[PDB]
């Protein structure tokens, strides 16, 4: 189906412990593939997926530069932004960048991204048109005007519409076996009597790719929200994902309940009874 | 404003040490150091993004060092120098990275690393009065001059008419001439011509000065030779108008 | 890594010439700089996919993605067009890797030439006199010294702006007493219409 490439940059200031920390992570859908740690001894972009290892030294040289240029910008920006907000000398701050693109199952371009956040909340964001910006506030407005005088959006659209998709297309083909695949969930169901008149019914889903899954509890086909506990989709660690949805029900009324499973790797949506 | 580069010219002995300072365009995040051997394509040494280093892969780290501490000005250092280092050291600046941004270069520092400083000689300026044969066959009079026996090629010629540096009716040779083409450390020769109307040269109420700017050694350099230390200096030769 | 087509070109003012830049690896941004004398290279054009064909004064450049090449078009030269022209290659982060370079000399059109070899006065500080070859055509080339004790400086363009008059000239000298005019430029091809005064 649909595919995406996302790069995540985290720069955290740390006074006393010298210059700030910069972590860079690369993603193709729900698969991490590249990484940069400004604290690591290598001082290079390193592989984290098998198919990216293939890429030449000229590739790895380029990636190192781009990510080093960005971290060095972030160190300055961490100071500049603290000034923009008229903030206090003492404390650690965070700058978060997220960018990348979306493609179709055909490979055709869908959307480009560039979003920035200072201390957990939005700062500056590139609109879907990839021509304009959105300032979260007045400090963000300074960057907005600075970046309009620098033709940032113009240069950003060039990457996102161009090279971002060319790179996504390349990776999707090279790592075809691990990326262009959909392994369905391994569903099972458990009973836990929490009372002599009540019991917790858990609907399980193990080892599935990608992360997009939908687990719903239906009493006589009618979907429930009440007593429906839902855990956040957690990574197994081997590249697949896990998720459970449980509901507390009265004893003897187990037959009225079904768990409806929706995943890309499934030929038909699953329906399970006790 | 423009990118500032200091010094303009520099002379260093075989294993001595030197620093090249550079100030980029105000607010420019990206700073570059390129080396240009003779006239050939400039070669990258180091790239900066504010206080930090983006790429130093092409730096001969055995001697070369570069620092831009406050993310503003930068200093390139060679310790110790080699005869292979004599080239123009170029510094450019970009607003950032940059696909739409073109570089803005500084005039560069010309370094000349020598065997012994004893090879350094200042020029000898001499003006030659316009030939009467020319002022008759033509309506013009052309003055000729020669800066001779100077080493290295750290010179700049200028023609001065009554206190004003002139550029119209002026021509200096693009390349100097080796007095002993055999040696590589051979002293150079350079000529420049100024052409005026015969009526201009015919007026003794007109002054012509030929000036050569040598960029020699400094007051800090140690000099033991019989002749005086060939320091940065202006050697000049002058001539006055004649009716006869 | 970029490959420049003509290393050196000697045009006659008013003529047109094309400089070609080639690349083995796909393009990003192509820069063009002109370096005059012993000075900083001045920026002319930067071309990206977004465009492609652009200009600076009366110089225009083209960018081709499929051909992985960029060309610099110089039409009706201005003699101020000398000398070196460099093309820069863009990295993903725009980091220049310069091509060889094109040393372009523009020779002017001397309308009414009258080749002549004169002897200049002086007699102070520096020993002997100097001989000047002047007002000759851009077609004639100045051959360097055969002798080791005699010096010949190659032709150079002078321009008296007050008269809209341009002229070529070569200078020769020596410390030797044997040295005189006509015999000074023997190694070189002196034109037919030539004046040696006495």
């Amino acid at each position: 189906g649909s595919h995406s490439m996302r790069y995540f940059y985290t720069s955290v200031s740390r006074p006393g412990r010298g210059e700030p920390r910069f972590i860079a992570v690369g993603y193709v859908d729900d698969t991490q593939f590249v990484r940069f740690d400004s604290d690591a001894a290598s001082q290079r972009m390193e592989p984290r997926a098998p198919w990216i290892e293939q890429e030449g030294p000229e590739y790895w040289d380029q990636e190192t530069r781009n990510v080093k240029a960005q971290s060095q910008t972030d160190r300055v920006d961490l100071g500049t932004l603290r000034g923009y907000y008229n903030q206090s000398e003492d404390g650690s701050h965070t700058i978060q960048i997220m960018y990348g693109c979306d493609v179709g199952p055909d490979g055709r371009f869908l959307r480009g991204y560039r979003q920035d956040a200072y201390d957990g909340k939005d700062y500056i964001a590139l609109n879907e048109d990839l021509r304009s910006w959105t300032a979260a506030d007045m400090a963000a407005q300074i960057t907005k005007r600075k970046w309009e005088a620098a033709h940032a959006a113009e240069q950003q659209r060039a990457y996102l519409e161009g090279r971002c998709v060319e790179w996504l297309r390349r990776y999707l083909e090279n790592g075809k076996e691990t990326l262009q695949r959909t392994d369905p969930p391994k569903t099972h169901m458990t009973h836990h009597p929490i009372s002599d008149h009540e019991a917790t019914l858990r609907c399980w889903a193990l080892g599935f790719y990608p992360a997009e899954i939908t687990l719903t509890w239906q009493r006589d086909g009618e979907d429930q929200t009440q007593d429906t506990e839902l855990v956040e989709t957690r990574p197994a660690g081997d590249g697949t994902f896990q998720k459970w949805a449980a509901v507390v029900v009265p004893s003897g009324e187990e037959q009225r309940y079904t768990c409806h499973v929706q995943h890309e790797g499934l030929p038909k949506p699953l329906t399970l009874r006790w | 404003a423009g990118v500032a580069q200091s010094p303009r010219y520099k002379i260093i002995e075989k294993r001595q040490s030197v620093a090249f300072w550079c100030n980029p365009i105000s607010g420019h995040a990206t700073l570059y150091w390129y080396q240009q051997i003779l006239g050939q394509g400039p070669k990258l040494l180091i790239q900066f993004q504010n206080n930090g280093v983006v790429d130093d892969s092409q730096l001969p780290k055995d001697r070369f060092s570069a620092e831009r501490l406050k993310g503003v000005d930068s200093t390139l250092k060679i310790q110790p120098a080699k005869l292979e280092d004599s080239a123009v050291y170029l510094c450019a600046s970009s607003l950032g990275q940059g696909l739409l941004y073109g570089y803005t270069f500084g005039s560069g520092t010309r370094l000349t690393v020598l065997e012994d400083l004893n090879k350094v000689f200042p020029p000898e300026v001499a003006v030659f009065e316009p030939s009467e044969a020319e002022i008759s066959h033509t309506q013009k009079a052309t003055l000729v001059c020669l800066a001779t026996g100077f080493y290295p090629d750290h010179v700049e010629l200028s023609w001065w008419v009554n206190g004003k540096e002139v550029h119209s009716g002026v021509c200096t040779d693009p390349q100097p001439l080796k007095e002993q083409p055999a040696l590589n450390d051979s002293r150079y020769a350079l000529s420049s011509r100024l052409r005026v109307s015969a009526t201009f040269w015919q007026n003794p109420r007109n002054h012509f000065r030929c000036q050569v700017q040598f960029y020699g050694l400094s007051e800090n350099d140690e000099w033991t030779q019989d002749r005086a230390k060939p320091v940065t200096q202006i050697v000049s030769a002058e001539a006055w108008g004649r009716a006869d | 890594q970029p490959v420049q087509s003509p290393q050196a070109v000697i045009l006659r003012e008013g003529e047109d010439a094309v400089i070609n830049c080639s690349s083995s690896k796909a393009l990003y941004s192509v820069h063009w700089y002109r370096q005059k004398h012993g000075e900083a290279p001045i920026f002319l054009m930067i071309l990206l996919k977004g465009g492609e064909q652009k200009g600076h004064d009366k110089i225009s450049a083209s960018f081709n993605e499929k051909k992985q090449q960029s060309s610099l078009y110089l039409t009706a030269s201005q003699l101020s067009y000398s000398g070196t022209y460099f093309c820069g290659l863009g990295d993903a982060g725009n980091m220049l890797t310069f091509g060889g370079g094109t040393r372009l000399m523009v020779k002017p059109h001397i309308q009414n030439p009258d080749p002549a070899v004169y002897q200049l006065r002086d007699s102070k500080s520096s020993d002997k006199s100097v001989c000047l070859f002047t007002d000759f055509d851009s077609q004639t080339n100045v051959s360097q010294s055969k002798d080791s004790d005699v010096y010949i400086t190659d032709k150079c363009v002078l321009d008296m702006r007050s008269m809209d008059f341009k002229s070529n000239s070569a200078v020769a000298w020596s410390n030797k007493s044997d040295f005189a005019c006509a015999n000074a430029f023997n190694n070189s091809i002196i034109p037919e219409d030539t004046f040696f005064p006495s």
Binding site: E63, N66, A150 | G98 | G93, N94
Partner: peptide, 10 residues
């Protein structure tokens, strides 16, 4: 492949 342009200050 990571973005190389623009990388400019805020």
């Amino acid at each position: 492949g990571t973005s190389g342009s623009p990388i400019i200050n805020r």
